[PDB]
């Protein structure tokens, strides 16, 4: 069991292309897959000097950019056992060290940045 948060950037081709974050609940997502990848890359890389991030630092990007319903709790996914989420998410998530933020990783849901709380 490890504790993760995430930022989710959706695109038009996901199964539910609408934001579920409080900031813009119901906003239809029309950006391309490529657009989502580029956006996730930018929101991460604007802080690329960071070896690790504090929780507050990661929650800032959740508040500004995440389109997942988890944004209603600042992107908290709680405790996750390996093998539960899709393989793409799981492998990247369980490769993180404490305080690290992943590179953009894609699943059916969209493009994620994954943060390991500890």
Residue numbers in the entry: 266 to 383
What does the report in the manuscript say about this coordinate set?
Recently, the nuclear protein TbPar42 (molecular mass of 42 kDa) has been identified, of which RNAi-induced knockdown in procyclic cells of T. brucei inhibits proliferation of the parasite, suggesting a key role of the protein in cell growth. Protein sequence alignment identified TbPar42 as a two-domain protein, exhibiting an N-terminal flanked forkhead association (FHA) domain and a putative peptidyl-prolyl-cis/trans-isomerase (PPIase) domain connected by a linker region. FHA domains are generally known as phosphopeptide recognition modules, although the TbPar42 FHA domain has not yet been proven to have affinity to phosphorylated substrates. Peptidyl-prolyl cis/trans isomerases are enzymes that accelerate the adjustment of the equilibrium of Xaa–Pro (Xaa being any amino acid) moieties within substrates.
The PPIase adopts a globular fold, which is characteristic for parvulin type proteins. The central β-sheet, composed of four antiparallel β-strands (β3-β4-β1-β2), is surrounded by four α-helices. A comparison of both structures indicates that well-conserved residues of Pin1-like parvulins, e.g., the histidine motif (His59 and His157 in hPin1; His271 and His377 in TbPar42), as well as a characteristic cysteine within the catalytic cleft (Cys113 in hPin1; Cys333 in TbPar42), are located at the same spatial positions within both folds. The hPin1 Ser154, described as a part of the catalytic tetrad is replaced by Leu374 in TbPar42. Residues Leu122, Met130, and Phe134 of Pin1, which are located at the concave side of the β-sheet core, constitute a hydrophobic binding pocket for the substrate’s proline ring moiety. At the same spatial positions, Leu342 and Phe354 can be found in the TbPar42-PPIase structure, whereas the methionine is exchanged by a tyrosine (Tyr350), Figure 3D. A homologous loop is also present in the structure of TbPar42-PPIase. Although the PPIase domain of TbPar42 adopts a parvulin fold and reflects structural elements of Pin1-type proteins, it is catalytically inactive. From all the current data, we may conclude that the PPIase domain of TbPar42 seems to have no enzymatic function within the protein. Residues affected by peptide addition were in near proximity to the proposed proline binding site (Thr265, Gly334, Val345, Thr349, Glu352, Gly353, Phe359 Glu373), but KD values were in the millimolar range (~10 mM).
